[PDB]
């Protein structure tokens, strides 16, 4: 199924996934499109933090729902 | 209900949904207009195009067409975001 | 004295030049000594006379002095919730 990954840069990313897939596989797909490693990636669904140990079905993430993308921001 | 939980980001979206689901043009578009009231001044990731844009694309009719643009212009009044 | 800059050059933001107080927003980010007056000037930059400033504090010193911006944004607003 398709989902939406909305950034805070006004940019919407679409990924073809399955409802039983883990979050880290989705972050691997984001790395496949972009080259950003998953430790630098954070995903938010309806104000809730996503953990890589669970699946999309565990958070009831379904076809073409909207995610949020915030990046790891460390300085110095 | 948006005045009741004001200046909030923690639980404002959660209180709307227990009275949102009624399948009404008047109850939802007042409750989803109240969602822009709760995050007014937070301007974090609540719905830049998430909830009230999903409200607005329902439109062929009354306040679904109307009561969705008032909340975002209220919540993002302090913004200057062009998108 | 340099701490009455942001609130009293909101006086000077609109009539003279919008960039002029933004060059004074630069003058905020110049006098970086150290945190105390630094904290209080930018308290007002969020929900006291304007917002639209939360893109100018993600510079190369994101530790605490340029991680004030998130605390400027919603954590002191959460302290205004803690009111």
Can you tell me the distance from the alpha carbon of A44 to that of A23, in angstroms, rounded to the nearest whole number? 11
Contact: A76, C58; criterion CB under 8 Å? no
Which of B48, B54, B81 to mutate to probe the A interface, most A CBs <10 Å? B48
Contact partners for chain C, using 3 or more CB pairs closer than 8 A, are A, B
Query: Which method was used?
Result: cryo-EM
Specify whether the CB–CB gap between B31 and B5 falls below 8 A.
no
Domain that holds residue A56: 1-76
- Report which of B11, B1, B65, B10 is spatially closest to residue B37, judged by C-alpha positions: B1
- Report which of B66, B51, C29 is spatially closest to residue A47, judged by C-alpha positions: B51
Specify whether the CB–CB gap between B40 and B3 falls below 8 A.
no
Contact partners for chain A, using 3 or more CB pairs closer than 8 A, are B, C
Q: How far is CA A42 from the centre of its chain?
A: 7
CA-atom Rg of chain C in angstroms = 13
What is the resolution in angstroms? Answer: 3.2
* Whether B5 contacts chain A with CB within 8 A: no
* Whether B82 contacts chain C with CB within 8 A: no
Give the Å distances, CA to CA, from C16 to A10, A20, A21, B22, B77. 32, 59, 57, 52, 23
What's the CATH code of the domain at A64? 3.10.20.90
Specify whether the CB–CB gap between A48 and A56 falls below 8 A.
no
Distance from CA of C50 to the nearest CA of B (A): 7
* Whether A7 contacts chain B with CB within 8 A: no
Nearest CA in chain C to A72: C62
* Whether B76 contacts chain A with CB within 8 A: no
Contacts of A70 in chain B (CB under 8 A): 45
Q: How far is CA A21 from the centre of its chain?
A: 11
Burial of C33 (0-12, 13-18, 19+ CB in 10 A): exposed
Residue with tokens 């510079």: C59
Residue B20's H or E segment, with its range, is: helix B12-20
Contact: C51, B9; criterion CB under 8 Å? no
A21 CB-near residues (< 8 Å, 6+ apart) = A55, A56
Query: How many domains is chain A partitioned into structurally?
Result: 1
* Whether C56 contacts chain A with CB within 8 A: no
Nearest CA in chain B to C74: B42
Contacts of A68 in chain B (CB under 8 A): 45, 50
């Amino acid at each position: 199924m398709q989902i939406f990954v909305k950034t805070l840069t006004g940019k919407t990313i679409t990924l073809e996934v399955e409802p039983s897939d883990t979050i880290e596989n989705v972050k691997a797909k984001i790395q496949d499109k972009e080259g950003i490693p998953p430790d630098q990636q954070r995903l938010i669904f309806a104000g809730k933090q996503l953990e890589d140990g669970r699946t999309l079905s565990d958070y009831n993430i379904q076809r073409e729902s909207t995610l949020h993308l915030v990046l790891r921001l460390r300085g110095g | 209900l948006g005045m009741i939980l004001l200046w909030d980001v923690d639980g404002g979206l959660t209180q709307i949904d227990k009275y949102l689901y009624s399948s009404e043009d008047y109850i939802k578009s007042g409750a989803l207009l109240a969602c822009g009231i709760v995050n007014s001044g937070v301007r974090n990731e609540c719905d830049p195009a998430l909830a009230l844009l999903s409200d607005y694309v329902l439109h062929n009719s009354n306040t679904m067409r109307l009561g969705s643009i008032f909340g975002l212009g209220l919540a993002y009044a302090g913004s200057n975001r062009e998108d | 004295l340099r701490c009455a800059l942001g609130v009293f050059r909101k006086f000077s933001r609109f009539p003279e030049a919008l960039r002029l107080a933004l060059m004074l927003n630069d003058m905020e980010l110049v006098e970086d000594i150290f945190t105390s007056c630094k904290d209080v000037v930018v308290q007002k930059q969020m929900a006291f006379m304007l917002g639209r400033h939360g893109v100018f504090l993600e510079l190369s010193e994101d530790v605490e002095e340029y991680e004030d911006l998130t605390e400027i944004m919603s954590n002191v607003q959460l302290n205004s919730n803690f009111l």
